[PDB]
Design an enzyme around this catalytic site. Structure first.
Site, PDB file in Angstrom:
ATOM      1  N   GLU A 206      -5.254 -10.042 -19.056  1.00 39.66           N
ATOM      2  CA  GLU A 206      -6.049 -10.674 -20.127  1.00 39.66           C
ATOM      3  C   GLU A 206      -6.683 -11.980 -19.569  1.00 39.66           C
ATOM      4  O   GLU A 206      -6.062 -12.664 -18.794  1.00 39.66           O
ATOM      5  CB  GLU A 206      -5.140 -11.053 -21.263  1.00 39.66           C
ATOM      6  CG  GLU A 206      -5.813 -11.860 -22.367  1.00 39.66           C
ATOM      7  CD  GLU A 206      -4.810 -12.329 -23.362  1.00 39.66           C
ATOM      8  OE1 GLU A 206      -5.079 -13.374 -23.984  1.00 39.66           O
ATOM      9  OE2 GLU A 206      -3.754 -11.636 -23.553  1.00 39.66           O
TER      10      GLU A 206
ATOM     11  N   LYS B 139       1.174  -8.446 -28.907  1.00 45.15           N
ATOM     12  CA  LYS B 139       1.934  -9.416 -28.165  1.00 45.15           C
ATOM     13  C   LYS B 139       2.213 -10.540 -29.186  1.00 45.15           C
ATOM     14  O   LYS B 139       1.300 -11.082 -29.814  1.00 45.15           O
ATOM     15  CB  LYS B 139       1.158  -9.979 -26.938  1.00 45.15           C
ATOM     16  CG  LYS B 139      -0.099 -10.822 -27.170  1.00 45.15           C
ATOM     17  CD  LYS B 139      -0.629 -11.364 -25.827  1.00 45.15           C
ATOM     18  CE  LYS B 139      -1.294 -12.753 -26.035  1.00 45.15           C
ATOM     19  NZ  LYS B 139      -1.792 -13.244 -24.746  1.00 45.15           N
TER      20      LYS B 139
ATOM     21  N   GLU C 126       0.833 -16.250 -18.931  1.00 44.33           N
ATOM     22  CA  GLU C 126       1.872 -15.394 -19.520  1.00 44.33           C
ATOM     23  C   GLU C 126       2.204 -14.201 -18.627  1.00 44.33           C
ATOM     24  O   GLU C 126       1.285 -13.588 -18.091  1.00 44.33           O
ATOM     25  CB  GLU C 126       1.383 -14.800 -20.800  1.00 44.33           C
ATOM     26  CG  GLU C 126       0.836 -15.832 -21.849  1.00 44.33           C
ATOM     27  CD  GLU C 126       0.242 -15.186 -23.088  1.00 44.33           C
ATOM     28  OE1 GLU C 126       0.422 -13.941 -23.383  1.00 44.33           O
ATOM     29  OE2 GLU C 126      -0.414 -15.942 -23.831  1.00 44.33           O
TER      30      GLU C 126
ATOM     31  N   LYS D 101      -7.140 -11.914 -32.630  1.00 44.28           N
ATOM     32  CA  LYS D 101      -6.561 -13.101 -33.259  1.00 44.28           C
ATOM     33  C   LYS D 101      -7.299 -13.451 -34.506  1.00 44.28           C
ATOM     34  O   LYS D 101      -8.420 -13.984 -34.467  1.00 44.28           O
ATOM     35  CB  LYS D 101      -6.564 -14.274 -32.274  1.00 44.28           C
ATOM     36  CG  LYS D 101      -5.669 -14.195 -31.097  1.00 44.28           C
ATOM     37  CD  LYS D 101      -5.962 -15.227 -30.072  1.00 44.28           C
ATOM     38  CE  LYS D 101      -4.811 -15.344 -29.147  1.00 44.28           C
ATOM     39  NZ  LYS D 101      -5.128 -16.102 -27.917  1.00 44.28           N
TER      40      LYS D 101
ATOM     41  N   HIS E 283      -0.281 -13.010 -31.618  1.00 37.59           N
ATOM     42  CA  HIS E 283       0.082 -14.319 -32.163  1.00 37.59           C
ATOM     43  C   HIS E 283      -0.765 -15.439 -31.559  1.00 37.59           C
ATOM     44  O   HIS E 283      -1.612 -15.186 -30.680  1.00 37.59           O
ATOM     45  CB  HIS E 283       1.533 -14.674 -31.818  1.00 37.59           C
ATOM     46  CG  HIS E 283       1.849 -14.708 -30.354  1.00 37.59           C
ATOM     47  ND1 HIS E 283       3.029 -15.225 -29.845  1.00 37.59           N
ATOM     48  CD2 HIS E 283       1.164 -14.250 -29.276  1.00 37.59           C
ATOM     49  CE1 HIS E 283       3.037 -15.128 -28.528  1.00 37.59           C
ATOM     50  NE2 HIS E 283       1.913 -14.524 -28.156  1.00 37.59           N
TER      51      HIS E 283
ATOM     52  N   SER F 144      -4.274 -22.899 -25.815  1.00 37.53           N
ATOM     53  CA  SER F 144      -5.331 -22.604 -24.834  1.00 37.53           C
ATOM     54  C   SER F 144      -6.463 -21.933 -25.632  1.00 37.53           C
ATOM     55  O   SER F 144      -6.644 -20.701 -25.613  1.00 37.53           O
ATOM     56  CB  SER F 144      -4.824 -21.714 -23.665  1.00 37.53           C
ATOM     57  OG  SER F 144      -4.198 -20.574 -24.199  1.00 37.53           O
TER      58      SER F 144
ATOM     59  N   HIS G 227       0.044 -25.800 -20.284  1.00 34.93           N
ATOM     60  CA  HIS G 227       0.932 -26.622 -21.057  1.00 34.93           C
ATOM     61  C   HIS G 227       2.371 -26.268 -20.757  1.00 34.93           C
ATOM     62  O   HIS G 227       3.224 -26.359 -21.629  1.00 34.93           O
ATOM     63  CB  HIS G 227       0.659 -26.338 -22.530  1.00 34.93           C
ATOM     64  CG  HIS G 227      -0.753 -26.617 -22.945  1.00 34.93           C
ATOM     65  ND1 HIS G 227      -1.736 -25.656 -22.935  1.00 34.93           N
ATOM     66  CD2 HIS G 227      -1.347 -27.753 -23.384  1.00 34.93           C
ATOM     67  CE1 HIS G 227      -2.883 -26.188 -23.329  1.00 34.93           C
ATOM     68  NE2 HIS G 227      -2.668 -27.459 -23.620  1.00 34.93           N
TER      69      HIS G 227
ATOM     70  N   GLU H 203       6.379 -20.090 -26.179  1.00 37.19           N
ATOM     71  CA  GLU H 203       6.439 -18.727 -26.731  1.00 37.19           C
ATOM     72  C   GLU H 203       7.801 -18.079 -26.515  1.00 37.19           C
ATOM     73  O   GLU H 203       7.897 -16.872 -26.661  1.00 37.19           O
ATOM     74  CB  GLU H 203       5.304 -17.864 -26.182  1.00 37.19           C
ATOM     75  CG  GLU H 203       3.925 -18.469 -26.498  1.00 37.19           C
ATOM     76  CD  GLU H 203       2.857 -17.459 -26.403  1.00 37.19           C
ATOM     77  OE1 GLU H 203       3.071 -16.423 -25.674  1.00 37.19           O
ATOM     78  OE2 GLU H 203       1.734 -17.690 -26.995  1.00 37.19           O
TER      79      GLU H 203
ATOM     80  N   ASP I 283      -9.948 -12.248 -24.416  1.00 35.05           N
ATOM     81  CA  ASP I 283      -9.322 -13.144 -25.398  1.00 35.05           C
ATOM     82  C   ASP I 283     -10.338 -14.316 -25.603  1.00 35.05           C
ATOM     83  O   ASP I 283     -11.087 -14.289 -26.537  1.00 35.05           O
ATOM     84  CB  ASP I 283      -7.984 -13.677 -24.870  1.00 35.05           C
ATOM     85  CG  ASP I 283      -7.353 -14.738 -25.829  1.00 35.05           C
ATOM     86  OD1 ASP I 283      -6.392 -15.400 -25.396  1.00 35.05           O
ATOM     87  OD2 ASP I 283      -7.843 -14.868 -26.959  1.00 35.05           O
TER      88      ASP I 283
ATOM     89  N   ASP J 292      -1.350 -12.546 -19.064  1.00 34.70           N
ATOM     90  CA  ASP J 292      -2.484 -13.294 -19.592  1.00 34.70           C
ATOM     91  C   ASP J 292      -2.716 -14.425 -18.603  1.00 34.70           C
ATOM     92  O   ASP J 292      -1.977 -15.386 -18.562  1.00 34.70           O
ATOM     93  CB  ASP J 292      -2.203 -13.867 -21.012  1.00 34.70           C
ATOM     94  CG  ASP J 292      -3.405 -14.717 -21.565  1.00 34.70           C
ATOM     95  OD1 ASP J 292      -3.383 -15.102 -22.741  1.00 34.70           O
ATOM     96  OD2 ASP J 292      -4.483 -14.778 -20.915  1.00 34.70           O
TER      97      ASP J 292
HETATM   98  O1  LIG Z   1      -4.204 -17.341 -24.883  1.00 23.84           O
HETATM   99  C1  LIG Z   1      -3.401 -16.597 -25.622  1.00 23.84           C
HETATM  100  O2  LIG Z   1      -3.474 -15.299 -25.667  1.00 23.84           O
HETATM  101  C2  LIG Z   1      -2.334 -17.162 -26.568  1.00 23.84           C
HETATM  102  C3  LIG Z   1      -0.999 -16.351 -26.489  1.00 23.84           C
HETATM  103  O3  LIG Z   1      -0.230 -16.393 -27.678  1.00 23.84           O
HETATM  104  O4  LIG Z   1      -2.085 -18.542 -26.339  1.00 23.84           O
HETATM  105  P1  LIG Z   1      -2.856 -19.621 -27.369  1.00 23.84           P
HETATM  106  O5  LIG Z   1      -2.587 -19.250 -28.772  1.00 23.84           O
HETATM  107  O6  LIG Z   1      -2.360 -20.926 -26.866  1.00 23.84           O
HETATM  108  O7  LIG Z   1      -4.342 -19.510 -27.021  1.00 23.84           O
HETATM  109 MG   LIG Z   2      -5.406 -19.120 -25.337  1.00 20.96          MG
HETATM  110 MG   LIG Z   3      -4.840 -15.397 -24.117  1.00 19.85          MG
END
Ligand SMILES: O=C(O)[C@@H](CO)OP(=O)(O)O
Ligand SMILES: [Mg+2]
Ligand SMILES: [Mg+2]
Ligand SMILES: O=C(O)[C@@H](CO)OP(=O)(O)O
Ligand SMILES: [Mg+2]
Ligand SMILES: [Mg+2]
Lengths: 433, 432
Positions: free
Chosen positions: B292, B393, B166, B342, B370, B39, B157, B209, B317, B244
């Site tokens: 989030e 997380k 999440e 991230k 992650h 995502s 997904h 996850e 995020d 999330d």
């Molecule tokens: O959106 C998020 O915070 C992450 C969680 O690990 O998902 P992705 O890496 O798919 O964006």
């Molecule tokens: Mg994402």
């Molecule tokens: Mg996220």
């Protein structure tokens, strides 16, 4: 020699505690962890858990950790032996435990140290692990194995009705290890689409080994799905199928329950003969080249009968438990023709290598294997290359406790260069290349 | 200086190709690998994929690997820079790529190198990774974070209808990091049973996850299940919930679709106002302390209005994409009060540490994260300790691309011995 050993509890891929060991030498820190099974044979060496109900639902491994830290550590340090001396160091631990099934210290205690010693011994020899392992086993000519990817999960590894445990694809027709990874992954991703199209998105979550866990009951349908994914991905000439039935999981009063995850009903149980007949249909209708634990771990007659009536690989797992005593019996009874090699079923590197060489001396194949409960450890990648067995099963190409081994194998392939040989269609007997 | 750099394709936790880098110095070999989201925010630095539809379904990273082996490696090596010089080495990469979003080499190529440099740097300093990162960041305290475990997976997904991405449990009342791992693992296994008894064994398989993927639609049912398991496990007083939403995944036409994994139907859309009222219901009825991406990455008005009307943690995020330019705007607009950090949304260690310090200097929390496609790399465990953020997380306690980080945090807690502190109830602001 060994300077210091320190064990701790870490979590495995299912979130259960397991043993990790740090071993220090003048060359540095060497770290190994111990895997854990779910469909565990009654003859496996003891995995020692704490049984404290108010801690990890009884699954802690503080007693094993304490055996290592307080007893095994000073013993090996006291020995003053070099970490290259894998057999002598393992023998000291077996003797100090003194029980046939490692039930004083636990196999998980002894193995954690055994693995770390072997990593330290490699470093002392100034050799990659795989090469040190080859030297311990008396091999010179290393080979990359065909990977067996468990892409549909059933049995005690997934929330579905499917009774048989693993449906594997083997890229025998790949050009290299790295190419086998591509074939495996591509079929796995194609399979996710096959399943989704047929059963919906909710059938595409995964079981404990990274394989999809579709909501099906019939084992032939899992076979049909995998065959369709191979074909749709364009690899029919190049990928074949293996199975781990794990029949000891559904053995019931002398019969077999292919719906064992549903409420008990003995009217549905089939005999060993009927089960055999089923496998005969599978071998004739699908490209199945290997079947693991087709019968219960004490059903010796059914094994022998079945093995005598097919031309494919028949793999002892719960039958043999990586144990020379049970392997000898199987060889004498011609119960199977391949050993599944699980270092934690026997509890030391030295005895696993002995088990491998015993099978190989008797014309058997050997398939190195993970457990259902794995860790980020990658020892078995090096182990299968140093043992030159030609086959490994260590998960779907999904969940990094599985990928970590497959990535390591790709790294070992790279390191070996134009002297990397891939087992391909000789996965049963790669010594001919 | 750097003796050799060699990149290769490995597979991530979903079985998709990703970049690994081996870097050699006189101290030895230092390896890192790059994660990959599903995502992914439209504002994330570019993940370069080969797009060869015949190979790995278009997902190969041979191009990125080539950029590192043919272009980046010889330049950094010719530079003679010590691997301790993170900023200079990252900056040289940034200038060679020359694009704002790292679209020429791929953010995946530049990060793979940046992470390996960092690990090699620590070894040159003769420090553990987490301590090197603290020095790069100018930190002296260290603190173990509260882990946020994603125990029910939903979203874009998920093999279910559940729209929000999440549902996490946070053992804020644990006694240490290692105690937080036991509380998490016990609630996880308690949750498996809760789900199995209500929905059957087919609802107990896992998503990307490692969280369970039950066949539900209603986000409040996810929360009820989580709350039950916490209580059944006996930990009501010591575990709280985070979410999330990943609302950018279900933004449609100026509205929100809480059933987006079902065939299109505009009639079911709600507005950001209705969505905010839903969240206020969650906070009142469940121990939710952090949400989030409650709104779309461009719906700035909803973020600011909701943040001003709640006292929970609100995490950017996809809104902020670990990017100092976006964070500046979010700070000015008071859009959120926590950054999800991230490293691969921005593409270099230096820039991630700058993003974290900008957030912290403006009184926000930071949660290290992650991606949903992870590897056996454990860099972010050392990261969250060195940046002292107090919260991470990195998955359910299931699937070793998650556990590898949690187990490394247990190791780091053990290494700090008596000097170990755990953020616990102070996860939002552990600097106190
Ligand atoms: O959106 C998020 O915070 C992450 C969680 O690990 O998902 P992705 O890496 O798919 O964006
Ligand atoms: Mg994402
Ligand atoms: Mg996220
Ligand atoms: O039966 C098996 O071969 C193994 C490997 O998948 O499963 P478990 O580790 O649970 O015994
Ligand atoms: Mg088994
Ligand atoms: Mg088996």
């Amino acid at each position: 020699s060994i300077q210091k050993i320190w064990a701790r509890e870490i979590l495995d891929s299912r979130g259960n505690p397991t043993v990790e060991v740090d071993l220090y030498t003048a060359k540095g820190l060497f770290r190994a962890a111990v895997p854990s099974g779910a469909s565990t044979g009654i003859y496996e060496a003891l995995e020692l858990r704490d049984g404290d109900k108010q801690r990890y639902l009884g699954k802690g491994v503080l007693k094993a950790v304490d055996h290592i830290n307080s007893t095994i550590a000073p013993a090996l340090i006291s020995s003053g032996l070099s970490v290259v001396e894998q057999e002598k160091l393992d023998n000291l631990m077996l003797e100090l435990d003194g029980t046939e099934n490692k039930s004083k210290f636990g196999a998980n205690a002894i193995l954690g140290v055994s693995l770390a010693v072997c990593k330290a011994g490699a470093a002392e020899r100034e050799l990659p692990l795989y090469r040190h392992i080859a030297q311990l086993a008396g091999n010179s000519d290393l080979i990359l194995p065909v990977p067996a990817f468990n892409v549909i999960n059933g049995g005690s590894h997934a929330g579905n009705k499917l009774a048989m445990q693993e449906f594997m694809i083997l890229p025998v027709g790949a050009e290299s290890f790295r190419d086998a990874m591509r074939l495996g992954a591509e079929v796995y991703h194609t399979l996710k689409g096959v399943i989704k199209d047929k059963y919906g998105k909710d059938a595409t979550n995964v079981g404990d080994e990274g394989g999809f866990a579709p909501n099906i009951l019939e084992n032939s349908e899992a076979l049909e799905l995998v065959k369709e994914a191979i074909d749709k991905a364009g690899y029919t000439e190049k990928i074949v199928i293996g199975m781990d039935v794990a029949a000891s999981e559904f053995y019931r009063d002398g019969k077999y329950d292919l719906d064992f995850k549903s409420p008990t009903d003995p009217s549905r149980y089939i005999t060993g003969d009927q089960l055999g007949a089923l496998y005969q249909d599978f071998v004739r209708d699908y490209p199945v080249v290997s079947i693991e634990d087709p019968f219960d771990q004490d059903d010796w007659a059914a094994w022998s009968k079945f093995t005598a009536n097919v031309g494919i690989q028949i793999v002892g797992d719960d039958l043999t438990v990586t144990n020379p005593k049970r392997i000898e019996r199987a060889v004498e009874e011609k119960a199977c023709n391949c050993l599944l090699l699980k270092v934690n079923q026997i509890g030391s590197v030295t005895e696993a290598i002995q088990a491998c060489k015993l099978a190989q001396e008797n014309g058997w194949g050997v398939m190195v294997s993970h457990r259902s409960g794995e860790t980020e450890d990658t020892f078995i990648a090096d182990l299968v290359v140093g043992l030159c067995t030609g086959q490994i099963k260590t998960g779907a190409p999904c969940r990094s406790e599985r990928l970590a081994k497959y990535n390591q194998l790709m790294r070992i392939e790279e390191e070996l260069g134009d002297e990397a040989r891939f087992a391909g269609h000789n996965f049963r007997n790669p010594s001919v290349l």
